[PDB]
Write a protein that binds this ligand. Structure first.
Ligand SMILES: N#Cc1cncc(CC(=O)Nc2cccnc2)c1
Ligand SMILES: N#Cc1cncc(CC(=O)Nc2cccnc2)c1
Lengths: 304, 304
């Protein structure tokens, strides 16, 4: 019993964190096999960040200008290349702690764990979600760039995010491990505004199922609805539209609790229209949307 | 920017998790040096749990009855002893991944990270606090016993909790690493009720300071108060009394923000009396109390 915002154990990723310094800029790198991945803005001075031409800035850099340190020991850089917004620094030593891994590009609404680092050293781990506007609400200070987001399936780490930027509003933007930003963001110190941060409806429903499994049932009502009726209310409350694919994904939770997905939608619809009335669900006074249906099943079944 | 419920990186603790089986009961153990620590209720059948006499049950157990497995390899048990509610199994091999460590007994209000495990395998990490009634609100299923709570100061892990029990209300109870329960709980399948779960006032104030540092300032008001006036309102709302020791501990946050501690108390007093009015602070609709002043400083300064 109990339901917590839970991150994956971070050990496998801690073994990959390195410090990358170029000139006077220091950030984090991810060392997998004999390649260190890091945000390409490591080559920029704060002045260059205003309007950088990365290809031009990279011409003035050689392998020896990239300083990579793993723990208190230096790695030898024998090659470097830019792939989209990340630099790949080939080193002469394969990371002995390289876990089994994949690079994945996640969809909005998907959750992942972040190992926040400074100077190639891990400081903390937290769970978050790719927002529908392709930002993430993280906890990152100057020096955190290159910190990564990941999910783990038994022994294989799927890396899905690398931190690059803080928008003027204090929300975060980054890339997948191929260097492509999530959303329309660019690695430039220019004002970029995020779109509407809508609520991830399928995740709220999964979390309402987690609440029922854990004894929080006060919000269950005597109504049902349809996908079209629910979605009219969802649009009004800036919730993402629910599709039959989302209903399918909630099937295991529906089966476990005996609550039809559309009945849970009707409970959610009344919570949107009536509010919580000072009550809480799983210790929260608002509807939580950073647990996917897969996360609820995993946490409630104890997947290791 | 951004403020997250952040756990310590769990790698150092992942390297200590083992599976302990006695008869038909399997739970988690913590392997430090040549000792494996685990809840003494590993020797109980579900029937024994109703009214166990641990000393009597232990007479029927020998070293070879305790099966300890680290990864997919078996450890040889060469000694066993009971210390309060934990068993200490001496093994013939010192854990090669033993980090620098201490055993600490925390006070209510203190926070720590939990590495939730099943069959000696880590499944997740989350942050929580020792409640003022000496329970913890965790996320633990059958098989999670022996999962541990810890804090890390640079490279030294201070273990403060080991999971033992779920109360009939779904809240959790456990011991320090010397086997002494936090609070009045006992390792017996008998109905035990928790006392009032009051709000950790000094932590709410620390989190209001974190909110100001991150731009959430709407709740700042034009008032101040005194410790005695604030505490009259705190008692009424089931908040822990604030002492001058708490005011002292909030000094660094007061200095950083320029908001006197008593002025922040007056903002908190108005939030208690007026409510949030549908507003949020750091993405929360209720006042968060599982961040200590030390956690706020650490997260806001990027301690690794
Ligand atoms: N890419 C990119 C980029 C562009 N302009 C500026 C930066 C620096 C930056 O965003 N800093 C920081 C600070 C706190 C949290 N996260 C990131 C990065
Ligand atoms: N000590 C002790 C004890 C006493 N009676 C019963 C138990 C078993 C128990 O509490 N199970 C469990 C299940 C889910 C989360 N946490 C713990 C343990």
């Amino acid at each position: 019993s109990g339901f917590r915002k839970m991150a994956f154990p971070s050990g496998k990723v801690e073994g990959c964190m390195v410090q990358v310094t170029c000139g006077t800029t220091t950030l984090n790198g991810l060392w997998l096999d004999d390649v260190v991945y890091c945000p390409r803005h490591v080559i920029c001075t704060s002045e260059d960040m205003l309007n950088p031409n990365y290809e031009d800035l990279l011409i003035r850099k050689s392998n020896h200008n990239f300083l990579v340190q793993a723990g208190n020991v230096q790695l030898r850089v024998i090659g470097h290349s830019m792939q989209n917004c990340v630099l790949k620094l080939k080193v002469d030593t394969a990371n002995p702690k390289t876990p089994k891994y994949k690079f994945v590009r996640i969809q909005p609404g998907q959750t992942f764990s972040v190992l926040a680092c400074y100077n190639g050293s891990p400081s903390g781990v937290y769970q978050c979600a790719m927002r529908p506007n392709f930002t993430i609400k993280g906890s990152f200070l100057n020096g955190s760039c290159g910190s990564v987001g990941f999910n783990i399936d038994y022994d294989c780490v799927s890396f899905c995010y690398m931190h690059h930027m803080e928008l003027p509003t204090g929300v975060h933007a980054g890339t997948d491990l191929e260097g492509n930003f999530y959303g329309p963001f660019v690695d430039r110190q220019t004002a970029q505004a995020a779109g509407t941060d809508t609520t991830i409806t399928v995740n709220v429903l999964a979390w309402l199922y987690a609440a029922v499994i854990n004894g929080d049932r006060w919000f269950l009502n005597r109504f049902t609805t349809t996908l079209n009726d629910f979605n009219l209310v969802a649009m009004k409350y800036n919730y993402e539209p629910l599709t039959q694919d989302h209903v399918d994904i909630l099937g295991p939770l529906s089966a476990q609790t005996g609550i039809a997905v559309l009945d849970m939608c009707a409970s959610l619809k009344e919570l949107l229209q009536n509010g919580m009335n000072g009550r809480t669900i799983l210790g929260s006074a608002l509807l939580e949307d950073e647990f996917t249906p897969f996360d609820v099943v995993r946490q409630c079944s104890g997947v290791t």
